[PDB]
Amino acid sequence: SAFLKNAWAKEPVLVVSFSVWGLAIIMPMISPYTKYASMINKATPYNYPVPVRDDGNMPDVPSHPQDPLGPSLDWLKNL
Amino acid sequence: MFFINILTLLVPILIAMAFLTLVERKILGYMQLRKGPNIVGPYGILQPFADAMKLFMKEPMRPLTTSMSLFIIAPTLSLTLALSLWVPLPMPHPLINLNLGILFILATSSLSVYSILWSGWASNSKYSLFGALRAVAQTISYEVTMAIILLSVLLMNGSYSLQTLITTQEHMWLLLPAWPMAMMWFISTLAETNRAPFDLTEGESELVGFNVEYAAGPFALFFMAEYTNIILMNALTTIIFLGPLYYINLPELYSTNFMMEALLLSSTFLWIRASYPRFRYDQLMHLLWKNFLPLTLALCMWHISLPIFTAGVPPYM
Amino acid sequence: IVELPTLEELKVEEVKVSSAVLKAAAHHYGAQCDKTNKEFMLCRWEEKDPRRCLKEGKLVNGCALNFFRQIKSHCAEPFTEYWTCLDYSNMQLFRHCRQQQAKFDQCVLDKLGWVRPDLGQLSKVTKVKTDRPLPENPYHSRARPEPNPVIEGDLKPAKHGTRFFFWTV
Amino acid sequence: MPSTFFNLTMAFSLSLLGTLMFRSHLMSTLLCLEGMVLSLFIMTSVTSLNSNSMSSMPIPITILVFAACEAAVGLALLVKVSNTYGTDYVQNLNLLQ
Amino acid sequence: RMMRWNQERRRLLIEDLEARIALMPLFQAEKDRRTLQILRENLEEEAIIMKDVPNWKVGESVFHTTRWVPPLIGEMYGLRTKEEMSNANFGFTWYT
Amino acid sequence: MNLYTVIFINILLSLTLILVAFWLPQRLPFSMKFFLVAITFLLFDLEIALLLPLPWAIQTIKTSTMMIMAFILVTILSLGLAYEWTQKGLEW
Amino acid sequence: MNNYIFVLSSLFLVGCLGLALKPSPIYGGLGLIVSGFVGCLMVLGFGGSFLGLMVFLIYLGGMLVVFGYTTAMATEEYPETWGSNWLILGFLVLGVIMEVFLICVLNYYDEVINLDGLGDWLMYEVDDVGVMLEGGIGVAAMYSCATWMMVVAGWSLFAGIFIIIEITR
Amino acid sequence: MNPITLAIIYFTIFLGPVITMSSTNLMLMWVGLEFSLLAIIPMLINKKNPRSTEAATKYFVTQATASMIILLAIVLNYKQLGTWMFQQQTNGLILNMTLMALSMKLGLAPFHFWLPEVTQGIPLHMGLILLTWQKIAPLSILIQIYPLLNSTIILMLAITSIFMGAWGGLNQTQMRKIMAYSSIAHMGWMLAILPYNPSLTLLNLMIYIILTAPMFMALMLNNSMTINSISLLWNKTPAMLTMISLMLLSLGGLPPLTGFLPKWIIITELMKNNCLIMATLMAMMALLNLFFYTRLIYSTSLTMFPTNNNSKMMTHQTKTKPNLMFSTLAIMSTMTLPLAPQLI
Amino acid sequence: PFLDIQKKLGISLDRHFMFLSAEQPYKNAARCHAFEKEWIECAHGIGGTRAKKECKIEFDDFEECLLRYKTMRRMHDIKKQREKLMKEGKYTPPPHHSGREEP
């Protein structure tokens, strides 16, 4: 601890340097948003979404984009 | 029309180069209780043109022991790269917008280290070689942190294109965030232009190395190069970290503020020069490898983490 | 030969309007005309051969054309203002123009009733059923060669043992 | 690429002929050695790019990263030699006969 | 502020990618239609020049598969306007 | 092409100057430290490369692996630096 | 223009011819830099920006700067041998011309050169309507999809430091 | 060596061959080869004697150009088949390059000049690694691609190596170089049967490793790089005289000892495949190898060379013992022949 | 390969990206993906010795999607005649070369 103190006052870059190294190694682990990154980027639609044939055996897939079925990004909205 | 634009970017910049020299010789003056050059022309405005003509007229000297190409390639390369790096800069519209723009600026800067290496080998005198070796080292070292500092920026910009930052900085300068790196970009910009606090490349008291055997026209070309760079790097600070206000309806208030911020930060390295003694060769590298590189590498990781857990991953494009 | 379709076979009307115009109305075209669009697309993907799905494609242009004719009939002025402002921008970014966008979008919710699709709800995969038989053997795959036969049975101690030079083993 | 991949390939062979016939300075070999890595890097990048094979772009760079260190080792040997013999000249390297 | 600004930007990134997603089907119908035309048009000229050729069918897939094959940009414009060819090859890189 | 046009004007402007400039007028300095730096420099320069794609990799769906990878790279090189400091290296 | 890539490729070959004739170490270095730029432009011609520009960053200013650096302290002065630099220059020029006719000869053998087919092959296929198909998206698989490619390289650099310091010591 | 560095290097020298063997993507096989090149160079110059720097600078240039040629083969394949790996279709020249290149890293035949010289300037210890844990890597790459390589070239490199190795060895008196030459020879047999029965290459290697590793730890027990030096073995440590005798005759093909099996089954496999031309000439000059092995036998065991009085002093002091590995690898090597059937 | 520590451990650090038909980023399909599949689902269960004769149709095609040399040839051949014919004044590029432009 004592050295820590002097280190804070002598060679006070490394201290800050390491501190950041860690804080970046922690915040991701503990945060209410970390999960969003993999989603927000997942959602971003870059490649055309090819439509599947309607065997008529699928109640999950929305038959029309504006239908009340399917995925939503309201999480992205009001984020 | 494209040429017209080519002319509009190069000619004005070159003229600005010239007057920076004058401005450097008056702002340093008033800081040191002296008027500076005002007698030639009105208020010294004709002063930059005057020595340009004296420099080109004086006999270019080719040392008995000197390569004749690694000697003439070196100033041509220095002016060519520096004026070239103004090609892809957002003001706000770039002349040649390149999707990987910042990598162009980083790569083109890196090539200038050769000119120093080639000129030092070409001179074939001891002062030149010793100066070049230390110089190349300074420049190269200040490239490793220089590059990492940009990579931290990009990751918060989303792309390598300098044009994107005008849209990233529509609400706040990237100084507020990332100020810790601005400082470290500013100091690295001072090293890479071999300006004062870091002018050991060509220390005068130490080795009166880069232009030892360079006089007249060759002296001028690097010379011109350095000063244009002095501006360019300051201008990159004024786009990457200090984002001038952009209004799509009127594009010139972007350039008007770009004008104001670039001049002030260009004024700052002039002010730094007069204010500080020059660092020692090892004291200079001690800073980058010990003081800055650990700060930069760690803050580099913080800039890969800030995006993810703050769900702020920047939009590509 | 190549059985490339003839020109008369592929001469159909198209929108032929500036990219910006399509872009300005894109959000509503993705809305009013995906039933047929998708179909053409589903035809396109499953039957890799475009030549096979050309017809669906003529339907595509057509559906859109009237989409435009209806716009032409109502809220046309709005749309005209929205596209002109959208076109001026170099990347034709949508946010520079929101005041013009609100008018046309509002109007089409008064005159055409059509609705601007909320953030998303266009990216989501769609189900469209098509008569065209799920092309079997797409890729026109040839027959897969037969797998080498399988030695069968259970191991039994080797016969007469390692048969190496003079090793009774 | 049909004939643009023959120039690069012959570049590699011209660089091959170089590394194999030494002359005086060792640096010229090392330097030559690097000429190949550039030719390999260019050819790998070229075909990956016209095969649209993005899954393979990692390689063009892995090639450079390994080649750089490879060269680092090579130069340290070179510095070691002109510390023991005052020159990089290869003739000096004839003690193991 | 950076967190909020990029989140706004990301939503915008989604709003316009989907805009093309909607516009793509039309482009696909257009591209193919035009692509075939280029192939066919080249067929006309092909026949015109390959007729005299001794026992050389006008056109034949170097590949025996009957699957539909996209033509190389080189095939589409090689015998077309050289300028057209150039535009396709290095046009985007030089942009505009 | 547009770039080619600009660049050749750029070389022309410089060659013009030097030409007028020459026409109008009418042995063993070695320190391993220096070599060592150059080396370190590339080891760092290569790393810069493995770190450059990070802007595109941010948008990668994984994210967790991205950061896990990137953090490992930065940490292992920094340790390289650490040992450079610990050893006489970086002490000129 | 259609030969833009052939030419660049040609100059590259010459550049390498230079390195091969082994001119003075530092001039040879200049040669590798010239070839380097030519090469970068080649990769930047087939559509790859990241791969190319990286060549510049890591290899043009990054790696050879070192070469020139070390070729500054340890490769002596190439003294008393400089004269050949002129002879080498000549053979280079002569060789270049030789090749000039040489490829003309190879062109004769139609049985590749596609003299007429020049500019028809620099690129072969493109996702005309694609968005995320830029060289680099791939280079990033190194962090996620392919990480082995990174864990191996990373080890190299790490071990590299320990190795170089040990050799240098 | 800061023990940390020792670990990093040794790990690399060991991760180097292991990545090569485990991976299938040739690229990853190339970097495995690259890591071995980088890791070995530091150890080679540990004494940092003037001879050493020469050794490493040769080893490195020979290794580096070969590494670049192997990469070119992978780069070319990538354009003749999108795959990153050799296939039935591979152009013949593509494979031949890989043979030459890999035969340079392994140092076979007309590329056998670097090995004897690097084996001469490196310590006895690093000599072993340079001879046996650095041959595993390239051979793995060849053994994997055996179905595709040329029977003609391999045979020529095989026969050449046998001859060069034998002839070279006859004149040499430095032990390090006698071993370097033997390795060239044995390496030759190994590459002879690769096209026909790779599984035997892996036997003719292990046996070579189980023979050479004891032989070198013997040379260094007394750290004798001269035959004259090994000849005074009788005074320095008498017991190893018996096994040094059998291991060296085992390295050559004499029938009661384990060393016959590799030559015997390689000859049986080549005759099964009809090379009764090639196999015969190889076996014959193989007999030349035993002549120089027995000449050493003479000096070290069958005849007692005169020693120095100062040797009595070294006897007094307790002799640091030879590791256990010597024994377990001396016996398993000198006499396992009665158990050949299960080995093959 | 020589030591399959990968299959055993179940890890796939080196196999996912060996062919052009492997998963490309953002599912941007490679070129010749129409064939390599057809040429490796064919040679699966059939060893090489017999992936080299009977599965020759799929490689002869995949050797042409990628190299795309027969095309180059045919095309080059076409041009030559066009050159000679153009010499006699026989061939006159149609304005189709410069016609309207389809959207």
Side-chain angles (χ1 to χ4, degrees), chain E:
Chain E
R1 167 145 309 181
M2 186 89 262
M3 177 178 73
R4 300 285 304 274
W5 177 221
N6 288 337
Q7 273 150 12
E8 166 59 20
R9 300 165 64 179
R10 295 293 293 188
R11 302 184 180 90
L12 306 172
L13 174 59
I14 297 192
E15 167 208 274
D16 65 9
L17 295 174
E18 293 177 350
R20 63 180 295 275
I21 306 301
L23 294 179
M24 173 172 175
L26 180 58
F27 297 125
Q28 178 63 206
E30 297 171 350
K31 176 175 54 181
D32 285 5
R33 183 179 300 98
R34 184 181 57 87
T35 301
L36 296 174
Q37 197 166 0
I38 306 184
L39 279 298
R40 183 75 157 178
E41 291 196 24
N42 298 338
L43 194 280
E44 157 196 355
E45 334 306 347
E46 195 172 8
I48 302 173
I49 59 187
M50 296 298 91
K51 51 186 304 180
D52 191 6
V53 181
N55 189 5
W56 158 283
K57 280 55 192 176
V58 175
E60 192 72 15
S61 63
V62 299
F63 59 88
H64 300 291
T65 71
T66 300
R67 173 175 52 262
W68 156 254
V69 176
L72 280 195
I73 47 189
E75 308 168 359
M76 293 189 302
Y77 306 104
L79 311 178
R80 276 191 175 265
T81 299
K82 175 181 180 180
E83 164 278 338
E84 288 176 350
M85 190 186 321
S86 180
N87 172 47
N89 193 351
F90 310 109
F92 166 77
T93 306
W94 294 356
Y95 62 89
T96 189

Side-chain angles (χ1 to χ4, degrees), chain B residues 67 70 73 100 103-104 106-107 110-111 113-114 117-118 121 129 133-134 136-137 140 143 160 281 316-317, chain G residues 24 26-27 30 33 37 49-50 53 56-57 59-61 63-65 68-69 72 77 82 131-132 134 137:
Chain B
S67 170
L70 283 70
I73 280 153
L100 289 194
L103 295 174
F104 170 99
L106 295 174
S110 307
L111 287 194
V113 63
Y114 283 104
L117 177 63
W118 291 341
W121 188 84
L129 203 49
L133 295 174
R134 304 194 314 179
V136 46
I140 63 181
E143 183 65 13
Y160 275 99
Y281 173 77
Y316 189 60
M317 318 177 185
Chain G
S24 181
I26 185 167
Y27 299 99
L30 194 164
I33 305 183
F37 202 108
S49 58
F50 183 92
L53 295 177
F56 275 168
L57 169 59
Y59 202 82
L60 261 78
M63 183 176 282
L64 275 66
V65 65
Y69 199 87
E77 294 183 344
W82 295 291
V131 176
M132 213 60 172
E134 35 187 346
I137 305 306

Side-chain angles (χ1 to χ4, degrees), chain D residues 3 7 18 21 34 41 68 76, chain G residues 9 22 55 63 67 112-113 164:
Chain D
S3 298
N7 321 322
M21 308 185 68
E34 287 302 302
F41 177 80
Chain G
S9 194
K22 293 184 175 71
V55 175
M63 183 176 282
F67 268 125
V112 188
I113 299 299
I164 186 55

Side-chain angles (χ1 to χ4, degrees), chain B:
Chain B
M1 271 299 189
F2 182 69
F3 289 86
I4 303 301
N5 206 349
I6 298 181
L7 276 306
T8 62
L9 180 275
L10 298 179
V11 178
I13 287 310
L14 218 50
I15 304 303
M17 177 178 73
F19 286 92
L20 177 63
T21 76
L22 170 68
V23 174
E24 181 167 355
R25 295 176 64 186
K26 298 183 71 68
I27 272 176
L28 295 174
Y30 281 97
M31 292 177 182
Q32 295 138 5
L33 275 66
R34 65 182 181 88
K35 298 183 71 68
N38 64 34
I39 186 167
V40 62
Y43 303 115
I45 60 171
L46 295 174
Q47 183 65 260
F49 306 112
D51 65 9
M53 292 177 72
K54 183 180 68 65
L55 275 173
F56 296 160
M57 291 177 182
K58 291 189 292 185
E59 163 261 353
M61 185 169 183
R62 298 138 299 272
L64 285 64
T65 55
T66 197
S67 170
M68 179 67 181
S69 192
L70 283 70
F71 193 100
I72 62 100
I73 280 153
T76 59
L77 177 63
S78 295
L79 177 63
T80 296
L81 299 155
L83 295 174
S84 296
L85 290 137
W86 271 89
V87 172
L89 295 174
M91 293 183 284
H93 289 212
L95 176 55
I96 297 182
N97 63 347
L98 279 184
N99 289 337
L100 289 194
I102 293 169
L103 295 174
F104 170 99
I105 303 301
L106 295 174
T108 316
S109 301
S110 307
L111 287 194
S112 64
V113 63
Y114 283 104
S115 64
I116 315 177
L117 177 63
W118 291 341
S119 59
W121 188 84
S123 291
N124 290 131
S125 64
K126 202 179 305 298
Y127 267 95
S128 296
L129 203 49
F130 191 40
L133 295 174
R134 304 194 314 179
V136 46
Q138 172 196 15
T139 305
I140 63 181
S141 305
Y142 273 87
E143 183 65 13
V144 182
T145 188
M146 184 176 282
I148 294 169
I149 278 155
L150 261 188
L151 177 63
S152 296
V153 174
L154 303 143
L155 292 169
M156 76 185 60
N157 166 43
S159 168
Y160 275 99
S161 179
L162 282 70
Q163 189 178 4
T164 58
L165 289 83
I166 297 166
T167 60
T168 301
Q169 272 150 311
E170 183 178 2
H171 297 165
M172 67 174 282
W173 289 358
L174 269 204
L175 177 63
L176 310 184
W179 65 255
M181 293 177 182
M183 297 187 184
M184 277 196 305
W185 172 254
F186 181 75
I187 303 301
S188 295
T189 64
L190 276 169
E192 196 98 1
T193 55
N194 287 339
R195 295 286 293 172
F198 318 93
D199 199 359
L200 51 77
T201 285
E202 185 249 4
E204 197 64 25
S205 61
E206 300 86 6
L207 297 183
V208 303
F210 188 44
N211 45 18
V212 179
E213 296 302 320
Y214 271 64
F219 177 76
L221 275 66
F222 292 136
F223 200 84
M224 293 165 49
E226 181 183 6
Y227 284 71
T228 299
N229 273 352
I230 301 169
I231 310 181
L232 177 63
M233 304 294 188
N234 275 301
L236 278 148
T237 300
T238 302
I239 304 301
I240 300 159
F241 287 102
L242 276 66
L245 62 80
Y246 183 63
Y247 289 128
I248 61 171
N249 64 34
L250 63 80
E252 71 281 5
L253 295 174
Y254 185 105
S255 64
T256 311
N257 288 284
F258 157 83
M259 177 178 73
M260 294 204 268
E261 293 177 350
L263 273 204
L264 295 174
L265 274 66
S266 280
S267 295
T268 315
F269 296 160
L270 275 66
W271 180 7
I272 296 326
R273 184 206 206 189
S275 297
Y276 296 144
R278 280 190 317 250
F279 272 89
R280 297 176 64 186
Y281 173 77
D282 64 9
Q283 190 178 162
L284 190 147
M285 292 177 72
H286 189 279
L287 188 147
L288 189 147
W289 290 95
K290 203 97 48 184
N291 297 132
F292 275 16
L293 177 63
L295 178 63
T296 309
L297 279 157
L299 295 174
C300 184
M301 295 177 72
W302 177 245
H303 284 135
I304 317 177
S305 179
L306 188 147
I308 310 317
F309 59 88
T310 59
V313 296
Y316 189 60
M317 318 177 185

Side-chain angles (χ1 to χ4, degrees), chain A:
Chain A
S1 173
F3 77 100
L4 179 63
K5 300 180 68 283
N6 64 45
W8 169 232
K10 66 162 181 50
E11 282 291 356
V13 198
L14 285 62
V15 174
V16 183
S17 176
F18 304 149
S19 171
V20 172
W21 177 94
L23 177 63
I25 217 69
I26 170 182
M27 296 301 301
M29 304 185 304
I30 170 179
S31 182
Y33 287 103
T34 301
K35 66 173 182 302
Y36 295 114
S38 181
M39 306 180 183
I40 183 179
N41 71 359
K42 183 191 306 179
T44 40
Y46 299 98
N47 51 358
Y48 189 84
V50 175
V52 297
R53 186 79 65 94
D54 309 7
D55 58 354
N57 209 358
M58 295 183 284
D60 50 358
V61 178
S63 181
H64 179 273
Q66 295 196 19
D67 293 355
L69 299 181
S72 65
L73 302 186
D74 300 351
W75 69 271
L76 168 81
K77 317 183 54 187
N78 57 83
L79 184 55

